[PDB]
RNA sequence: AGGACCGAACCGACUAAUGUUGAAAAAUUAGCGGAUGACUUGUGGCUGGGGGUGAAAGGCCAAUCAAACCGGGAGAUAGCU
RNA sequence: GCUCGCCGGAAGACCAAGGGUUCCUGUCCAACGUUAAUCGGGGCAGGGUGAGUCGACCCCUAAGGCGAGGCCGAAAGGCGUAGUCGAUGGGAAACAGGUUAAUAUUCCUGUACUUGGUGUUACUGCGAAGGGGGGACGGAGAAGGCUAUGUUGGCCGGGCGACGGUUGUCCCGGUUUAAGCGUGUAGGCUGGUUUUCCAGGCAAAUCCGGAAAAUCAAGGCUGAGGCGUGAUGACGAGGCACUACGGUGCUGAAGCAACAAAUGCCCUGCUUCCAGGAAAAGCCUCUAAGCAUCAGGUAACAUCAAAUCGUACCCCAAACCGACACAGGUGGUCAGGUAGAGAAUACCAAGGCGCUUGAGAGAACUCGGGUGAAGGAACUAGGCAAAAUGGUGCCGUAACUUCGGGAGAAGGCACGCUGAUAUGUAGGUGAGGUCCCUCGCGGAUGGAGCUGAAAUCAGUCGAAGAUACCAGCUGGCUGCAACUGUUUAUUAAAAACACAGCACUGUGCAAACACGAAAGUGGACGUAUACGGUGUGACGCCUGCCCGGUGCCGGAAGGUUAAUU
RNA sequence: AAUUCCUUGUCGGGUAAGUUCCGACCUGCACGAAUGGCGUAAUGAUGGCCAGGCUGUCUCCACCCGAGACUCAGUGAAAUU
RNA sequence: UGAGCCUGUUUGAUGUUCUAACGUUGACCCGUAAUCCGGGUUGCGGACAGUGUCUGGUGGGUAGUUUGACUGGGGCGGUCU
């Protein structure tokens, strides 16, 4: 639910929140946690290699099953949960034999549901099948790119992929960017689409909100000197030159893809 | 007014100590140079 | 509840007078801003010079910065005093 | 030695970091001490630091450092696996009294506790480099039970006052006692027990996880404080005889209750929010290969052991960082009385100091303050500087607005003391007595004693009752940036930088991009509702015409065009 | 007009008197639509103008309380020549 | 598919198919007590990708330098046989 906040303060005038009363309140599951430390953008040489990163809140890592092995055993949904490492909720499931696991949460999945994976599994949301057994014209998410590797496509909040044609040992897919791609038919996928589609209708409200998440200020290149950027200098406000990156390449139009190893799996590019 | 020198034995020894000098090729050159000149104190270690 | 309000500890530096071979190679006295947050402080660690870090002033890198300090090429060159 | 002044959330007491004999006693005054010096943190000589329980060493890990074989690089070298180091973090145990010129949880007296080795007796499935539990974790807010501590009364010992009164509702002093052991309260959390079965925990499990019957409703874990013992002891004003001025031996009264009360304990608890809040060991459990007469395990007695290094002194300062016995800088703990909301401000307690040149005079001028007849910005680039307002409770308050604001808008009235209401009122705590009871740190009734606001009526003093220190000046019209924030250490704090929001463009994962001769690493244990670059800067109404020039994107039929033959 | 040289343009308000301030005119030397245009409640140790109160800022200065300056005893520099 | 030789013989370019060099930052076994490294089996791309020598294009991202004299002061004008 999207809720606006009352203007009791200038930093609270423009705040919109997303509230879900079904998420669990309490501690997470312990056997599936790990420690994660921060970096600041620095690599093993100690240098800033990506900019505008640093600070924030402490976080712990939740292990998730992007494989979806374990065919033939039904599982029951126990509780939905919050995750600070991604933009989608997660769900805890208990298997018929006494093992628990974390999975991504699709749309319309609630406590008390039954899920399954395998060649012979049903066709309903939350179920996993190799893409050689799904009808043409279906909506899937968590798609693999190599047989047995793990999901890599359509893992963010609200997203999904569509199956268009099947011919041979390959399946043709339409992605969220407007692109057509080909992948092997022995890969896996999950029915339905990812949940928490309200994620994009939030407004932060103040600079501290972005600072809480680990984002540091951005400085324009036209405010610097000629020794710092190709956009610096001037007596007053001046540009008079073609826009470029901080290292001398042209933004606003130029292209940067160069990969001759994978050009044969692209059918049509994003328009 | 805070000044530049603020002593700490741990940092002093980890920075300019005998073992620190011996851990690297150039530190051995520092030691050889001082030995040739004929100094009474080689390093900062007591 | 709140980058909410008044105000000590703590963190700053807007006006005036003294001082200028000073008590002090940047301070003192009377007033002044923030004060549950993008806050403040102890201990240890990592980034090395055409390089680093920079909410960006050519700012800072041991009272030294439009290219640190130290030792060498070196008695560089000086139609100039 | 007697007076006087200053600090008292410090200008008192104890530590860490950092120094290293500055500590105590004897003797000296050349040089040091901004002056004299018999004095010194100065010269010379001797003395002083006592640990199973305080720390370090030791067992375990964070960020990070090194790194056998390994991958990579003209040499030099770079990055990393198995490992091995690295506290600011986790891991056993001790309290009171007396004592030296200088040490004390270490020495003496009294009463305690913790971990291992060895021998004997009695019962017996033990076993790791493996599996499970636990350690183990955020911000804010609320009120219930307590203690440290204070005030008054009661009790014991003295006093009868340099000048009017003071045998009393009078004046001064004391009323202190720990760790350990037993009791398990205020309160917090969780239903207990038996049997069968099972695609899970790299193999095994009586341990963890899951499914199914029966039975029973009270079992278990946690926990400040109070109470008894420790204690026929110790301490305690004074007194009985001598003094080197540091003291010896003995003797020793009372040693109770009521009220108020923390930012400390219960509390790592309870309620609520999104930004979703460390690792490994010590410790408790289960087994595998293996040994079963053995070895080993739990319980009781006796014996032994706990080694090595620090311990003096300063520590908001004359002993540390500033060349100086320098008006500067420097992290943690302790928190008395009267007014007061208060750790602000004023006077005091315990304790500590008067800051290492003095004595006179009472000119101009300079520095820090007080008062001013009539006028009231006439001064000046400019009300720069000074003067002025300043508390609580009640009445009352405009344009505009994003409906939260503006607002403490503006402007007014009361404020001391004594008596009555009421020999201390409305509230707060609460003994005795009567019953009930599973008989206890219980339940109901009961009111002795203690403490104590705000208000109304009527009197009274002064020029002034928020009387001292403390403690907002207010209103009208305009330019710029929406707002809280940042910046030129040492002449510029702003209209400059950032910002929540908006648009363009790249990127299909071995992603674009960046540090690297390479191996590798960040982006990210992320996947187009995600990531990098460039411009504008909340919000409202909007954002028109130009593709000739320079860039960028798509085409590819024609002309020109490299090495090579 | 943070932009306008000629320029103290011209008209109205405020003062006894106003090269600054406020409201308009269009003759824009040389505004203008994300190197954004026109508005805007609340906020500012931000730039300009006007009132009430208050005063030694001023007509125009007078007295008083403290530390120096002067005299006595001890110690004892400096720039320049 | 256009070109030699003596419909038959070599050398070219375009396209289909294959596996055996090469890639694997897909799955499983061993060294081994290990998400590095090497070996083995099996899928997927496949003479593509990628590297060495040579060669045309773009290249203020970085580096070393040039930008005259006379002159009633220098600059702007004008001149220099």
mmCIF file of N, CA, C and O in Angstrom, chain B residues 13-36:
data_model
loop_
_atom_site.group_PDB
_atom_site.id
_atom_site.type_symbol
_atom_site.label_atom_id
_atom_site.label_comp_id
_atom_site.label_asym_id
_atom_site.label_seq_id
_atom_site.Cartn_x
_atom_site.Cartn_y
_atom_site.Cartn_z
ATOM 1 N N UNK B 13 57.214 1.402 16.213
ATOM 2 C CA UNK B 13 57.971 0.181 15.969
ATOM 3 C C UNK B 13 57.473 -0.548 14.733
ATOM 4 O O UNK B 13 58.268 -1.135 13.993
ATOM 5 N N UNK B 14 56.165 -0.533 14.488
ATOM 6 C CA UNK B 14 55.662 -1.179 13.285
ATOM 7 C C UNK B 14 56.033 -0.416 12.022
ATOM 8 O O UNK B 14 56.006 -0.998 10.936
ATOM 9 N N UNK B 15 56.380 0.866 12.136
ATOM 10 C CA UNK B 15 56.710 1.666 10.963
ATOM 11 C C UNK B 15 58.209 1.715 10.669
ATOM 12 O O UNK B 15 58.615 1.499 9.525
ATOM 13 N N UNK B 16 59.050 2.002 11.669
ATOM 14 C CA UNK B 16 60.481 2.184 11.439
ATOM 15 C C UNK B 16 61.339 1.203 12.235
ATOM 16 O O UNK B 16 62.428 1.561 12.677
ATOM 17 N N UNK B 17 60.885 -0.032 12.421
ATOM 18 C CA UNK B 17 61.600 -0.973 13.261
ATOM 19 C C UNK B 17 62.564 -1.874 12.497
ATOM 20 O O UNK B 17 62.608 -1.891 11.267
ATOM 21 N N UNK B 18 63.338 -2.647 13.263
ATOM 22 C CA UNK B 18 64.371 -3.493 12.674
ATOM 23 C C UNK B 18 63.764 -4.574 11.790
ATOM 24 O O UNK B 18 64.231 -4.821 10.672
ATOM 25 N N UNK B 19 62.716 -5.230 12.278
ATOM 26 C CA UNK B 19 62.074 -6.278 11.499
ATOM 27 C C UNK B 19 61.384 -5.706 10.268
ATOM 28 O O UNK B 19 61.411 -6.313 9.190
ATOM 29 N N UNK B 20 60.789 -4.522 10.400
ATOM 30 C CA UNK B 20 60.205 -3.858 9.242
ATOM 31 C C UNK B 20 61.257 -3.581 8.184
ATOM 32 O O UNK B 20 61.026 -3.808 6.993
ATOM 33 N N UNK B 21 62.421 -3.085 8.597
ATOM 34 C CA UNK B 21 63.484 -2.825 7.637
ATOM 35 C C UNK B 21 63.956 -4.111 6.976
ATOM 36 O O UNK B 21 64.196 -4.144 5.765
ATOM 37 N N UNK B 22 64.097 -5.184 7.754
ATOM 38 C CA UNK B 22 64.599 -6.431 7.192
ATOM 39 C C UNK B 22 63.581 -7.132 6.306
ATOM 40 O O UNK B 22 63.962 -8.010 5.529
ATOM 41 N N UNK B 23 62.301 -6.775 6.402
ATOM 42 C CA UNK B 23 61.291 -7.427 5.575
ATOM 43 C C UNK B 23 61.363 -7.051 4.098
ATOM 44 O O UNK B 23 60.667 -7.679 3.295
ATOM 45 N N UNK B 24 62.165 -6.060 3.712
ATOM 46 C CA UNK B 24 62.152 -5.553 2.345
ATOM 47 C C UNK B 24 63.577 -5.371 1.843
ATOM 48 O O UNK B 24 64.522 -5.244 2.625
ATOM 49 N N UNK B 25 63.722 -5.360 0.517
ATOM 50 C CA UNK B 25 65.042 -5.234 -0.090
ATOM 51 C C UNK B 25 65.668 -3.872 0.175
ATOM 52 O O UNK B 25 66.880 -3.786 0.397
ATOM 53 N N UNK B 26 64.875 -2.801 0.148
ATOM 54 C CA UNK B 26 65.423 -1.464 0.344
ATOM 55 C C UNK B 26 65.768 -1.182 1.805
ATOM 56 O O UNK B 26 66.705 -0.419 2.082
ATOM 57 N N UNK B 27 65.044 -1.784 2.748
ATOM 58 C CA UNK B 27 65.399 -1.620 4.149
ATOM 59 C C UNK B 27 66.775 -2.170 4.467
ATOM 60 O O UNK B 27 67.531 -1.582 5.250
ATOM 61 N N UNK B 28 67.124 -3.304 3.864
ATOM 62 C CA UNK B 28 68.477 -3.821 4.015
ATOM 63 C C UNK B 28 69.507 -2.846 3.465
ATOM 64 O O UNK B 28 70.608 -2.738 4.013
ATOM 65 N N UNK B 29 69.169 -2.116 2.404
ATOM 66 C CA UNK B 29 70.087 -1.107 1.890
ATOM 67 C C UNK B 29 70.249 0.045 2.871
ATOM 68 O O UNK B 29 71.358 0.556 3.059
ATOM 69 N N UNK B 30 69.162 0.458 3.518
ATOM 70 C CA UNK B 30 69.265 1.477 4.560
ATOM 71 C C UNK B 30 70.212 1.011 5.662
ATOM 72 O O UNK B 30 71.099 1.753 6.109
ATOM 73 N N UNK B 31 70.040 -0.234 6.108
ATOM 74 C CA UNK B 31 70.884 -0.758 7.177
ATOM 75 C C UNK B 31 72.346 -0.827 6.752
ATOM 76 O O UNK B 31 73.240 -0.466 7.525
ATOM 77 N N UNK B 32 72.611 -1.292 5.532
ATOM 78 C CA UNK B 32 73.987 -1.377 5.054
ATOM 79 C C UNK B 32 74.631 -0.002 4.980
ATOM 80 O O UNK B 32 75.799 0.174 5.345
ATOM 81 N N UNK B 33 73.877 0.986 4.507
ATOM 82 C CA UNK B 33 74.393 2.341 4.382
ATOM 83 C C UNK B 33 74.766 2.902 5.749
ATOM 84 O O UNK B 33 75.856 3.462 5.937
ATOM 85 N N UNK B 34 73.874 2.738 6.725
ATOM 86 C CA UNK B 34 74.157 3.237 8.066
ATOM 87 C C UNK B 34 75.335 2.504 8.693
ATOM 88 O O UNK B 34 76.156 3.116 9.383
ATOM 89 N N UNK B 35 75.438 1.192 8.473
ATOM 90 C CA UNK B 35 76.573 0.441 8.997
ATOM 91 C C UNK B 35 77.884 0.944 8.414
ATOM 92 O O UNK B 35 78.881 1.072 9.129
ATOM 93 N N UNK B 36 77.912 1.207 7.109
ATOM 94 C CA UNK B 36 79.132 1.715 6.494
ATOM 95 C C UNK B 36 79.507 3.075 7.063
ATOM 96 O O UNK B 36 80.681 3.332 7.348
#
